[PDB]
Each structure stands twice: as structure tokens, then as C-alpha cells.
Design a protein around this ligand. Structure first.
Ligand code: HEM
Ligand code: HEM
Ligand SMILES: Nc1ncnc2c1ncn2[C@@H]1O[C@H](COP(=O)(O)O)[C@@H](O)[C@H]1O
Ligand SMILES: NNC(=O)c1ccncc1
Ligand SMILES: [Cl-]
Ligand SMILES: [Cl-]
Ligand code: NA
Ligand code: NA
Lengths: 713, 713
């Protein structure tokens, strides 16, 4: 059956904004996962998971009699898809159980791991999500094997269909670099937003870069991909050495024995995949990666043996029984136990990527310090495992249950507790009147509040106006935020705040974070008034102001908007067309297509464009909230053409006279071109739609202002 | 960006069940189109459209100074996608404005027609849908040119995204038959459910079959395609001769002048397409189909000149300026006016497909009668145009506004008016107890009510339990409906009804249509009771009983279910896997994936399978409403394999002992295989889900029972 995607393979895809509707969701529209989880007996679930660790099933027998290593890898993989570039991937939505991640080659046989968990999932039902269960099971695996975790938070609601994520353009699984859809260019630069070296891998290739077994070169890839998953050198060495303290790899025979991945298998496989014709197909005969490495002398117990082996032998290149490159300890005794046969032992072995930890010079120093000071290794690994597995969960307000660590960590972008009375409605009116009397313009108020609130992304729940981080480095210096204008607005707001706060009794004060948002609301009210409409814009107080020391400047850099269609901003020229980047941003903002449409049309006429550009400002009453953008965009009296200077800018001329009326970008004009977007524009550009436009705009404005307000959830 | 569809191109596509969410809809959740339309001043809209017919725009100048022919073609195309096989296509959702239909080659330059209508759409806003406006504009075109229409009904609500429709497998627009994706096999058999001869055409090729200009052969294709659009010979001739009484074709120069269709054009084209480099690109230079035919001497007025010309001249094969085959009248005077130059005239011309009306022997008789009796022609055309343009609107209860014809037409599957008091809640309880006391079983009651209600399809809103047509030909003899069992159930219900009705005062009585549904509800209540649960199943009375004489038997044939996954029924072996046919059915029933899932699992254990098959009956308490289907399906203690006898049937055996536990079909097992479906099955198979399963089952059961109840909208 030929589809629209076949006929117009580069048209824009709006379905990404309309996933996750109530239609695909089996839970009622009233289901609240946080409330269900709060009633879960978490201790009881952890007792069942402890029991599961050594209850081997015949259909996938446990190595060493203990599933701990398998489950740690399962949890690591659930979390390990994460990219800091867009916040997409991670454990937070339980996406490992859906295509494509359920069938990635690096997730081979994790289908068996997930299936082992079905009895517990069934027992507890909706009170524990798959997403939480995958992570909890990793924690319990670690605890069972002697390792004390830093903590655990529930609250990851399950999702019910695959996310739309750009995982790369390759059409072959695991394609090596340099092909027609290469993710690499230049001096082995990985394209943003990607965070893995090959399609279907988590981070790097365990044999080495593109299969070449050079541990020094592999270190380069490790460092780059882990950085792109928010991990520095110390965390990276702690995580790899930590994880590879446990368990083993599986490569007992040639890879050609392994059949179809889950999404390709027959219906009788009942959701499992990679069935193997090699001997029994499982247990001692298991094939997963094709490598055959067991790192420690006690694979089911926490030890300091990883670094003892790493530094204690010299390593020789060799091949697994599937033909894969791996390393064996020169002249070692057979000290490693076998997984099934008590009468066999093996020499210590390593992956190329394990040797990276010793032969990259910066890693080597960390690895040595961890070898000499295992307490530091244990602490770093615990902190890094917590980070890895919670990275995409958002503000601390979302953390549920009795095991949440009390220590606040820098990576969480923390927000101080509010310890004073909040402003009430009378105080809000007083502050909005002051803001309006100060001489700040609609355009300045709207642009500042948009700049503050629209850093939010729902993918990892980072960003938003809470914290007033727009006043700190680096947000205050981002080109999209118009630094000089921003500084003048913030200075006027700060004086207003200082004056209000100094006049108070009883400890009441207003944060700058709240006042920025409140001032934006006043701007929207004033604009509606300018258009002859009487509008109150909703406002919820309670934001607090974070300090510069609570704001990691490097980590913040990935939230910089290099494309923001809502302010008609593009930081440079990109391979991806700007309207694709607009839809991408709308998706991160959690907007539907109707919301994106109304929001953008309104921002254009309120003066939210960067640099005061006239592009898309299709009104003669700027700073008045009207549907002018739509009515003028859809006017057939105007003809549009790309400019001579720039193919991405368009001139709109009176069809009869030739006179120039407007200019716009691809982002402006896509609303009059794409057939679904134009149908939306039509609704708002109709003669009966003025009040609907205003009201819809206020609702989406308020939605954006509140995106990070999990303290009110 | 590689997607799941690229990696697993034959996985099942569930997104088709999740279109039309509230996310994609710009109207609020409470918007009621029927209410808006009822207040539209329809006379005022029609006066604006009348004025439009002769107000030429220079960007697409009106042929002969009148847009009427163009708009008639627009409306005919809007309706002309319709297929009787599945009810899909037609004018009822305004789908012509979305991909792919907006860009079909047969719809070239209808983009210009739709754009002409924007000022009127904008004026009246939400009170008239595009869907309604396309049709209304065709009616007004006809009226403006002297033709009396049979009537008009509003009520087609707009849609906001493309429908997922199988339009064929070809990857090339207009591909000739016999290719690798040929829609033809055998002796020029068109594959179901298709109703056009080539990808991107409405019905047939105007040059003739695969371009061969033989009017006799073309008549074969016309007859076949029009039948597949619910039109018989009389209707077909009336429609083609009717339409081709007006306007002209456009083929003023070579087709290679014509650029990209709308979905492929640049953003500056603002949703228009087919931009032509030939001379001025429009008006006298227009190119659309590539043919250049003007049929009558007054292209802007109703006449009987099409048949006068058809029969009055002999015809010669010729070529348009774009190279297309067409026909010219041998030795005629130049009597046909030019579209732009009052000093030029032309000889009468025809399409190969127009000549079909004269040279096919059965058409020729009808055409002769219409020629001799143009009043008969006018009446047939008006009836056929009404039918064409309303065929997918559903029951008469959906027809809005002041121009609805009072005459009830056989094709409407009409339902008589109810002229008596309805049963109340206490009466419903009394009848449910009587049904249960008669000894009809849960399985008989459920099966019968499902058979009656599940003929509904949302694509053309035909079918459903209203009318009690399950008791008439042909429904009562469909194999899926189990004719002998059905007859025994209907007999018992009829006696119950006759007794209840004869005991009444005051004219109160119950229809057999209501009682079939009510009896099904009793069946579901009893089943819930068998499981130890007390529920009340909702029931709305007001169905009426249609007669055999009000039931066109041939038209009803397309509603026969040849695949019904919900009763594990397949009438023969098909190309398409049964699980794809299940999803197809659920989409016709308007079900989401969660609704399909709950509904099927519940029907399995209530005994709704055809022939009492045990396939998928994963319970030891048949006729009790439990979630046993899911708990047993997901039990990893059971292993499944295809049978030796049949690859489409599977045995489930105890994994440890090999003991046979169950059998199932692909439809049963897909819920344990497909990763999104199995995630739904898990919800219902969890230990906390019994109450939820019952509640959700009852809700979806009730939804199905009410699908055709537009009398209560
Ligand atoms: C450079 C990064 C890494 C690479 C290239 C890598 C590679 C691998 C490979 C190839 C396997 C064997 C899969 C199989 O054949 O069954 C494996 C196993 C494992 N890895 Fe990693 N790994 C990496 C980082 C991590 C991290 C961050 C963790 C956890 C904190 C981890 C924990 C594990 C565990 C527990 C196993 C054993 C699985 C079992 O016992 O079944 N690894 N790793
Ligand atoms: C075998 C069936 C049919 C064939 C092959 C067919 C073919 C065509 C073609 C090729 C054109 C010219 C497109 C162009 O170059 O602009 C056309 C025009 C037209 N057709 Fe049809 N037609 C059929 C049936 C119908 C029916 C059922 C109607 C309406 C009741 C209709 C009404 C018209 C009208 C009004 C025009 C003129 C458009 C204008 O003035 O711009 N046709 N037809
Ligand atoms: N552009 C490249 N392509 C492939 N391998 C590279 C590239 N650049 C560096 N390497 C490998 O990474 C190692 C570490 O180099 P560097 O990361 O430049 O200090 C080198 O010695 C190479 O083996
Ligand atoms: N692909 N996933 C996201 O982009 C996302 C997920 C949840 N809320 C917002 C965005
Ligand atoms: Cl994601
Ligand atoms: Cl459709
Ligand atoms: Na994420
Ligand atoms: Na339809």
C-alpha cells in the first residue's frame, strides 16, 4: 500500500505532535501514575525482585545461577539511549519495550530479561510502570550482589506507543562509518543530535571504532559519546568499570546462528527474538554480542577485581568463538569461573573498550586512583549510576517514594525551596500595574517571558522559567535571548521586585522567576487591550530563583536554542529545513499542531521576533493581540517568491500592483503551504475567529509558562 | 531519518486507529458542527456563491466568464473517490484538501477551485465546513446555469488530517496496468477494494483503457468502476452526460510544461500546484488533463446539446495539443464557443469515454431515451447527483438544513419513523429477565447482537443494528451470522416481543431491532454475573424495524463480513494477513487499539466465535466475563507453534510437559506478539485489572451497539 510518506518523502511530519493521545492510551484520562505509585508497597516489590535474581527459567537459564548481570545491562540500556542534545532517549518512558529499541542489536536478549519481569509487573499492575520497574530491577541486581545504591525515585509514567526519534539515517543495522548516510564527517565528528557510533548501538562498538581493535582510538569514541550522554571522564570510567565488575558477554558460536530480531520474528515467538540454532540456543550456548568475555573472578558479587585484572596483566589480541576481537591476559592462570560448568575455569579477558580505561592517558589516571582507592570507585559508581538512571526525570519534585536521595546534585538544575508566603491576586495586580507603568513594552515583556519559559523540553524535563536562570550564565548571553535588551528588561524588573519586596510585611516576597513570568502575562493582557479585548491571563506563583553555583554552565549549553521558529530565529544555516526544526521544537514543548499554530501567529504580532525582524509580522498593529498573521498570510491578493539575496526569505507582493507588502521565512510560510497546517491557519484566519484566537493564544501561553511547574502537579 | 516502517515494512500499522484525536483538532472538545450549521444562513452563502460564479480572478481566469464547470468537476471529484467495498473515499470528510487527493493528477487545478472559495469559507467560518462547501458550491454552479437540483443536506464535519486509505500498490502516478504492482489480474479484474483503473484517477482513463482509444472497451471500465462506486447503468449515463453538458477540458499545450503537484511544490506556491510554463499558464493557455474538448454550444447553461452532438455527428480520432487522444465531429461547422475569444468558434469534440455512451450497446439505449426525453435525463441526473454527493453521509437523521429532500430513497437503507412511546428502564429490565428466562445462552445473545451491530462502518456510516436487517435477506443468510442458529434466536426473541407488546397499554411497544440489542446487553450482564460481578449495561431504545421492501439486497452485499477477527472468522484464504484485516475492521468500527483489544478478549470468552471454534478461547469458564484471554495469552508457561495441517493455526502447549492447552489463530496471537498490542494486553492481564476489564468491555460493547444512533446525536 503506497502512502503519503512514499509519495512526498520530504514533506513535514505532523504526526509526531499527535502521538500520545488518549486514543492510544489504555488508562483512563483521569489516571494519575504518581498517585498509583505512592500506594505501591515498594519493599514488597523489591523482595520479589530479590527472589527473581536466582530463580532460573529453563527457556533462558541464568548465568552463574544469578540474573543480576543481565538485569544491570538491561537497566543500563534503558537509560543509555539518552542524548543531551535534545534530551530524547533515556529510561524515563520505558521505550525499551517498543520498536525500534526493543530490536536494536545492542538490546539482543534483553527481551528475555523483560519477559522474566512479567510475573512481577502483572502482580503489581498499574502501581509500578515498566519504566520504573526496569530501573528498580537494576538497583535490586546491584543490591543483591553486594553493592549499595545511592537511592531510587519512582515516577516514570509508562507510554503506549513508540516515540518519534531521529536515531540516524543509515538503512543498514550497525553500518560502519563513511557510507551514504554516514553519521560521521570531518575529523571523525559525530552528527548532532546523535550519541552512538553506529545505528543500533548504545554508545560505542566493543571491538573498537568501526571494528578496529585499538583501545586508544576507542577511548576517543567513548569520551565523545558519553559526553553526549552527560557523563564526564570520572563518571564514564566509574560506570564502565562498575558495570563490567559483574556478569559476562555471550558469544559461544558464530553470529549466523542467530535469527530474527523481535519486530521481525514470527508471531509464534510471542514478542521474543534472536532465536539461536547454536546447540541449545541459550545458557552456556548463548549468543548475544558475539564476544566471550567474563571480567572478574566473582561475576555475581561486587569486588575490586576489574581494576586488579586490568592493571595486573598484559593483554593479547584474540578472537571469540563468533570471530569477534577481544583480549586475553598473557600467561594468566585460569581463575575466572564458568557460568554453567563448575569444573571449568577461564583466563581473564577484556573488551577493547575496557582496555581504553588503561591506555587512554586521562582515563588511566582515574582508573589508577580507583584501583588504589576502591572506596572512591564505589562512591563514584553509585553517584553515576543514580545520575545515569534519573538523568531524564526532571526536577526533584517529580521523584517519588521512600528511597529518594536527600542530597541535591548539581546535575539536577536544582531550585531552592520556597520558605515564605507567596504573592496573592491583589499583589499580582499591583506588580502588573508597576510593570506597565515602568515603560517596558509589550514586545519586551513577551520576548523576555518567552525566552525564560521556552527552554523547557519534555524529553528530559529540563529547562523552563523556574529558577530565573535567564539572568545567569550562560542563558543571559545567548544570542537568541538578545542580551542587551534582556539586560535592560531584567534591570527594570529587579528594581520593581526590590521595591515590592522591601515594602512587605511578614516575610512575603516575589521571586524574579515569578516576576518575569508575571510581567510577560501583563504584556499579553496589554496586547489584548491594545486590540480592544478584555483578557485576564492566568498566573501561578511559586517559582524560586536559583544561584549561579546551582547552575552548571556546561550542562546548560545544550538548552541553547539554535533554532526557534517562535522567534523566527536560526543561528546558522543547517541541513534540516527550518520548518522541520520548528516542529521539532514544538514537540519538545509538548505542543500539538493547533497549539504551535496559534502560539506562533500570536508571537509574531506581539513583537517576539529576535532583532525586531519584520519577517512574518503580518500586521499594521504590532503589539496588539489579533489574528492578523493568519488573515494576511492567507490573503490570495498576495503572491510570494524567494528573494534573490536569500532562497530562505520570501517577498509577498500585491498580485495586481507588484508592490511589496511583507516578507517571511520558511517558518512563516509553511503555514500557508503545508496542507494540514494551512487548514489550521484557516480556522484562526476566519471572520468568526477573533475571540477564539485570543482565548486559544492565552491558553497556550499559560501552558508554556507552566511547563516545568511540577511543584503544582 | 530511518523509521520503524523502513525497518519492519510489514509490521501491522496501528496509527490508523489513532487519527482524528483531540490533539490534531483545532476546534474545542465541545464544538458541535451540526449546531453551528443549523444557524448558518444558507441562503446568504448561496447568494455569495452565485456571485462568485461570474467574478473572474486573474490568477485563474474563468472559462467563458463562468466558474461553474470547474466547480461541478470539483464537487464530482470530492464525491467520486468513493468505493462501495469499504465505504472509504467520498465527499463526506472534505478529504480533497489533504494529501494525497489534493495532489492526484485527476485533481489537477482543483486546487485553484478550492482557493476561489476561501473568501466565502473565511466569511462564514465554522458554520460551514469545507466538506459541505465543496458540495454546496457544485449545487450552486448547477442552479446558476439553469439546472434544478434534487436538494442538499449539510452535516459533513471537517476533518483535520489525511485518512489512511489503501488506494493501490503502484509507486508511479497513473501507472498503466500489468506492472509489478498491477491492480488488474485475470480477465481485467480490478482488485478489491479499488474503484479506479490507475493510481491517481477518479474512475477511468479518458483516452480509453490504458490509453487505448476504443470506446467499446472503455465502456467496460466505466461500467465496472461506476458499479464499484454504487452507480448502475442508468445513473452512470446520467452523471457523465450531465457533467459533460458543462464547461471544458484543458490541454492547450504539452504536458511537460506543467510543474509539481501541490504536495511537491515549493513553499512559495502557498498550497497551489501544477504551475505551467506554457504561455500565460492559465485561462486560454490552461493545461489540466492534456485534453482539449468543449462539449456543448452553451457551456455555461444547462441544455440537451451533449446528446444532440453525441448522436448528431460522426466522430474522428484526433489529438489534442498535448498529444492526447480525443474525437472531433467530422465535417461539422465551428459552432462551439471559445472560452476567451468572442471571435472564435470550434467544431464539437468528445472524449473516448463520452463515445462509450453511444457505442456500448446497453448505454446506447439509455442515452437514446435521454436524448429523446431530456426531462427524463434531467430527473435522472438530479437524482444521481444527489446520490453521488450524499452517498457516504449515513442515515437521514444526519441531514441538516432547509434543502433536504423529503423523498426517501431506497439507497439510503431507510429506517421508518417511530410513532409510539418507547420502553423505559423498568421495561428494559423486565425484557432482559424474560430473555434470560427463555434459556437463550450468553453465547447466543452476544453473537446475535454482535452480528447485528457490527455491520456498521464509519467510512460511509452504513450498517449497524438499527432496522433489524439481520432478520432480512441477505444478512440472515450470511455465513458469519450462522443462519440456522440466528433463525432460532430470532424466533425466540420474536415471541418475547409479541408477548410484551400485546400486554401493553397506550401504544407502547418495542422493536425487534431494540430487543436484539437489549438481549445482547442481558447476555453481557449475565456473563458478568457468571464471573461474580453485578453490572448494568447501558441501553438506549428507539431503533425501528425496516422491511424487506425497504432493503436493497444487492447494495447490502458489500457489508457482508468476510473477515471478522472479533468472531475469529475468515470466509476464505486472502493475500492480506488476518491481523491486518482485524485492524481494518476495528478502524471501520471506529475503535482505538485499546478498544479493539478489550473488545476481542471479552468476545472470545463469551462465546462469540463463529461455529463455536475454540480458537482463542483461553478460559476454563466460557460465558463468564473475565480477563482470562489476556492472563492465559501472556502466560510464559505456554509455548506456541504453527500446526502441520495449517500455518495460520497455532497450538499452545505447556512448556515443561508438552500438554496441549489451547489453540489460536493469527488474530488471537497477534496480541502476544505485536509490541504495542502486547503492552495493551498486559494492562488487562494484570492482577489489578478485573474491574477495569469489565468496565472497559461494557463501554466498548455499548459504543458498538450505538454506532448508527444518529437519532440521538
Ligand atoms: C563503553 C561502554 C560499554 C561497552 C562497549 C559495553 C559492552 C558490553 C558488551 C558487548 C556486553 C556483552 C553483551 C552480551 O554479549 O551479552 C556487555 C555486558 C555488560 N555490560 Fe557493558 N558495555 C559498556 C558499558 C557498560 C556500562 C555503563 C554498564 C553499567 C553500568 C555496563 C554493564 C554491563 C553488564 C552488567 C554486562 C553483563 C551482562 C550479562 O551478564 O548478561 N556496561 N557490555
Ligand atoms: C467516465 C467518467 C468521466 C471521465 C473519464 C471524465 C473526464 C473528464 C476530463 C478528462 C475532464 C477534463 C479535465 C480538464 O482538463 O480540466 C473533465 C471535465 C469535466 N467533467 Fe468529467 N469525466 C467523467 C465523468 C464526470 C461526471 C460524472 C461529472 C459530473 C457529474 C463530470 C463533470 C465534468 C465537468 C463539469 C468538467 C469541466 C471542468 C471545467 O469546466 O473546468 N465528469 N472530465
Ligand atoms: N579522524 C580519525 N579517524 C579515525 N581514527 C582517529 C581519527 N582521529 C584520531 N583517531 C584515533 O584516535 C586515536 C586517539 O587520537 P586523539 O583522540 O587525536 O588524541 C588516534 O591515535 C587514532 O588511532
Ligand atoms: N521523543 N520524545 C520527546 O520529544 C518528548 C517526550 C515527552 N514530552 C515532550 C517531548
Ligand atoms: Cl524518546
Ligand atoms: Cl476516507
Ligand atoms: Na528523554
Ligand atoms: Na467514506
Amino acid at each position: 500500500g503506497t502512502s503519503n510518506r512514499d509519495w512526498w518523502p520530504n514533506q513535514l511530519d505532523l504526526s509526531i505532535l499527535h502521538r500520545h493521545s488518549s486514543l492510544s492510551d489504555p488508562m483512563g484520562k483521569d489516571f494519575n501514575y504518581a498517585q498509583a505509585f505512592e500506594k505501591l508497597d515498594l519493599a514488597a516489590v523489591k523482595r520479589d525482585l530479590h527472589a527473581l535474581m536466582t530463580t532460573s527459567q529453563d527457556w533462558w537459564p541464568a548465568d552463574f545461577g544469578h540474573y543480576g548481570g543481565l538485569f544491570i545491562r538491561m537497566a543500563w540500556h534503558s537509560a543509555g539511549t539518552y542524548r543531551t542534545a535534545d534530551g530524547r532517549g533515556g529510561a524515563g518512558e520505558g521505550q525499551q519495550r517498543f520498536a525500534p529499541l526493543n530490536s536494536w542489536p545492542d538490546n539482543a536478549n534483553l527481551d528475555k530479561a523483560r519477559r522474566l519481569l512479567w510475573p512481577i509487573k502483572q502482580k503489581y499492575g498499574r502501581a509500578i510502570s515498566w519504566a520504573d520497574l526496569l530501573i528498580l530491577t537494576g538497583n535490586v541486581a546491584l543490591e543483591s550482589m553486594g553493592f549499595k545504591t545511592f537511592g531510587f525515585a519512582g515516577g516514570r509514567a509508562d507510554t503506549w506507543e513508540p516515540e518519534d526519534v531521529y536515531w540516524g539515517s543509515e538503512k543498514i543495522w550497525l553500518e560502519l562509518s563513511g557510507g551514504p548516510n554516514s553519521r560521521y564527517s570531518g575529523d571523525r565528528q559525530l552528527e548532532n543530535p546523535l550519541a552512538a557510533v553506529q545505528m543500533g548501538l548504545i554508545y560505542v562498538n566493543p571491538e573498537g571504532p568501526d571494528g578496529n581493535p585499538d583501545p586508544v582510538a576507542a577511548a576517543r569514541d567513548i569520551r565523545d559519546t558519553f559526553a553526549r550522554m552527560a557523563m564526564n571522564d570520572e563518571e564514564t570510567v566509574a560506570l564502565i568499570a562498575g558495570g563490567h565488575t559483574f556478569g559476562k558477554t555471550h558469544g559461544a558460536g558464530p553470529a549466523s546462528n542467530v535469527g530474527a530480531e523481535p519486530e521481525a520474528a514470527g508471531i509464534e515467538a510471542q514478542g521474543l527474538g534472536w532465536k539461536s540454532a547454536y546447540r541449545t540456543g541459550k545458557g552456556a550456548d548463548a549468543i548475544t554480542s558475539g564476544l566471550e568475555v567474563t571480567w572478574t573472578t566473582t561475576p555475581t558479587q561486587w569486588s575490586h577485581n576489574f581494576f586488579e585484572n586490568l592493571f595486573g596483566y598484559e593483554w593479547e589480541l584474540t578472537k571469540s568463538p563468533a570471530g569477534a576481537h577481544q583480549w586475553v591476559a598473557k600467561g594468566a592462570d585460569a581463575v575466572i569461573p564458568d557460568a554453567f560448568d563448575p569444573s571449568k575455569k577461564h583466563r581473564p579477558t577484556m573488551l577493547t573498550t575496557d582496555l581504553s580505561l588503561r591506555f587512554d592517558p586521562a582515563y588511566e589516571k582515574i582508573s589508577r586512583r580507583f584501583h588504589e582507592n576502591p572506596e572512591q570507585f564505589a562512591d563514584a559508581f553509585a553517584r553515576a549510576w543514580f545520575k545515569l538512571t534519573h538523568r531524564d526525570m526532571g526536577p526533584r519534585a517529580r521523584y517519588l517514594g521512600p528511597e529518594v536521595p536527600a542530597e541535591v546534585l548539581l546535575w539536577q538544575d536544582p531550585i531552592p525551596a520556597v520558605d515564605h508566603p507567596l504573592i496573592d491576586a491583589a499583589d499580582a495586580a499591583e506588580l502588573k500595574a508597576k510593570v506597565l507603568a515602568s515603560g517596558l513594552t509589550v514586545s519586551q515583556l513577551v520576548s523576555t517571558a518567552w525566552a525564560a519559559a521556552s527552554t523547557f523540553r519534555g524529553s528530559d524535563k529540563r529547562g523552563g522559567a523556574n529558577g530565573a536562570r535567564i539572568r545567569l550564565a550562560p542563558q543571559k548571553d545567548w544570542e537568541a535571548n538578545q542580551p542587551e535588551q534582556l539586560a535592560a528588561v531584567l534591570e527594570t524588573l529587579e528594581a520593581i521586585r526590590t521595591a515590592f519586596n522591601g515594602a512587605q510585611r511578614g516575610g512575603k516576597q516575589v521571586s524574579l522567576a515569578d516576576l518575569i513570568v508575571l510581567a510577560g502575562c501583563a504584556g499579553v493582557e496589554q496586547a489584548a487591550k491594545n486590540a480592544g479585548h478584555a483578557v485576564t491571563v492566568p498566573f501561578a506563583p511559586g517559582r524560586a530563583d536559583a544561584s549561579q553555583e546551582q547552575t552548571d554552565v556546561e550542562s546548560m549549553a545544550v538548552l541553547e536554542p539554535v533554532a526557534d521558529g517562535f522567534r523566527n530565529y536560526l543561528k546558522g544555516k543547517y541541513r534540516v529545513p527550518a520548518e522541520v526544526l520548528l516542529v521539532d521544537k514544538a514537540q519538545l514543548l509538548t505542543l500539538s499542531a493547533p497549539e504551535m499554530t496559534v502560539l506562533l501567529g500570536g508571537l509574531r504580532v506581539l513583537g517576539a521576533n529576535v532583532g525586531q525582524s519584520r519577517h512574518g509580522v503580518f500586521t499594521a498593529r504590532e503589539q496588539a493581540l489579533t489574528n492578523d498573521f493568519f488573515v494576511n498570510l492567507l490573503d490570495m491578493g498576495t503572491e510570494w517568491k524567494p528573494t534573490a539575496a536569500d532562497a530562505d526569505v520570501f517577498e509577498g507582493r500585491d498580485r495586481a500592483t507588484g508592490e511589496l507588502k511583507w516578507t517571511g521565512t520558511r517558518v512563516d510560510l509553511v503555514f500557508g503551504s503545508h496542507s494540514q497546517l494551512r487548514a489550521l491557519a484557516e480556522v484562526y484566519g476566519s471572520a468568526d475567529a477573533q475571540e477564539k484566537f485570543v482565548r486559544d493564544f492565552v491558553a497556550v501561553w499559560n501552558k508554556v509558562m507552566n511547563l516545568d511547574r511540577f511543584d503544582l502537579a
